[PDB]
Scaffold this motif. Sequence first.
Motif, PDB file in Angstrom:
ATOM      1  N   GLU A   3      -1.794 -31.533  34.876  1.00  0.00           N
ATOM      2  CA  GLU A   3      -1.713 -30.580  36.075  1.00  0.00           C
ATOM      3  C   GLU A   3      -1.444 -31.923  37.224  1.00  0.00           C
ATOM      4  OE1 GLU A   3      -5.343 -28.813  38.354  1.00  0.00           O
ATOM      5  OE2 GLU A   3      -4.439 -27.226  37.179  1.00  0.00           O
ATOM      6  N   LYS A   8      -0.675 -27.393  35.214  1.00  0.00           N
ATOM      7  CA  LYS A   8      -1.717 -26.717  34.252  1.00  0.00           C
ATOM      8  C   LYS A   8      -2.161 -25.297  34.384  1.00  0.00           C
ATOM      9  CE  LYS A   8      -5.864 -26.733  33.811  1.00  0.00           C
ATOM     10  NZ  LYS A   8      -5.583 -25.949  35.264  1.00  0.00           N
ATOM     11  N   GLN A   9      -2.322 -25.006  35.690  1.00  0.00           N
ATOM     12  CA  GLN A   9      -2.907 -23.866  36.350  1.00  0.00           C
ATOM     13  C   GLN A   9      -2.885 -22.516  35.459  1.00  0.00           C
ATOM     14  OE1 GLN A   9      -3.536 -24.177  40.975  1.00  0.00           O
ATOM     15  NE2 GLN A   9      -1.513 -23.266  40.303  1.00  0.00           N
ATOM     16  N   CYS A  10      -1.493 -22.418  34.878  1.00  0.00           N
ATOM     17  CA  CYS A  10      -1.330 -21.180  33.559  1.00  0.00           C
ATOM     18  C   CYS A  10       0.240 -21.397  33.061  1.00  0.00           C
ATOM     19  CB  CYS A  10      -1.359 -20.001  34.671  1.00  0.00           C
ATOM     20  SG  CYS A  10      -1.565 -18.496  33.680  1.00  0.00           S
ATOM     21  N   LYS A  12       3.312 -21.270  31.395  1.00  0.00           N
ATOM     22  CA  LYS A  12       3.983 -21.055  30.362  1.00  0.00           C
ATOM     23  C   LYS A  12       5.427 -21.280  30.220  1.00  0.00           C
ATOM     24  CE  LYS A  12       3.246 -17.467  33.038  1.00  0.00           C
ATOM     25  NZ  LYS A  12       2.852 -16.084  32.497  1.00  0.00           N
ATOM     26  N   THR A  15       6.243 -23.063  34.645  1.00  0.00           N
ATOM     27  CA  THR A  15       6.465 -24.810  34.381  1.00  0.00           C
ATOM     28  C   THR A  15       7.771 -25.028  34.858  1.00  0.00           C
ATOM     29  OG1 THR A  15       6.397 -26.850  33.109  1.00  0.00           O
ATOM     30  CG2 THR A  15       6.776 -24.629  31.994  1.00  0.00           C
ATOM     31  N   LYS A  32      -2.926 -19.222  38.224  1.00  0.00           N
ATOM     32  CA  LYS A  32      -4.122 -20.101  38.331  1.00  0.00           C
ATOM     33  C   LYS A  32      -4.950 -19.684  37.033  1.00  0.00           C
ATOM     34  CE  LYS A  32      -4.758 -21.363  42.944  1.00  0.00           C
ATOM     35  NZ  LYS A  32      -5.349 -22.777  42.876  1.00  0.00           N
ATOM     36  N   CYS A  33      -4.588 -18.957  35.847  1.00  0.00           N
ATOM     37  CA  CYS A  33      -5.491 -18.309  35.099  1.00  0.00           C
ATOM     38  C   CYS A  33      -6.044 -19.377  33.878  1.00  0.00           C
ATOM     39  CB  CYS A  33      -4.380 -17.663  34.132  1.00  0.00           C
ATOM     40  SG  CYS A  33      -2.707 -17.283  35.165  1.00  0.00           S
ATOM     41  N   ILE A  34      -5.357 -20.411  34.115  1.00  0.00           N
ATOM     42  CA  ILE A  34      -5.643 -21.712  32.989  1.00  0.00           C
ATOM     43  C   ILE A  34      -6.431 -22.584  33.640  1.00  0.00           C
ATOM     44  CG2 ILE A  34      -5.226 -23.276  31.073  1.00  0.00           C
ATOM     45  CD1 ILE A  34      -2.670 -21.873  30.441  1.00  0.00           C
TER      46      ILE A  34
END
Length: 34
Positions: A3, A8-10, A12, A15, A32-34
């Motif tokens: 991150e 990192k926030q989500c 897939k 990025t 912000k899912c992850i």
Amino acid sequence: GKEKEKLKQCFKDMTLAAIDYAKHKVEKHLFKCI
């Protein structure tokens, strides 16, 4: 770490594109899912 910015926030595929926008613009409002 992973991150470095908002990555990192989500990240897939976002990025690549949407993180380039999240770090510099504001596309962080999308994830912000992850």
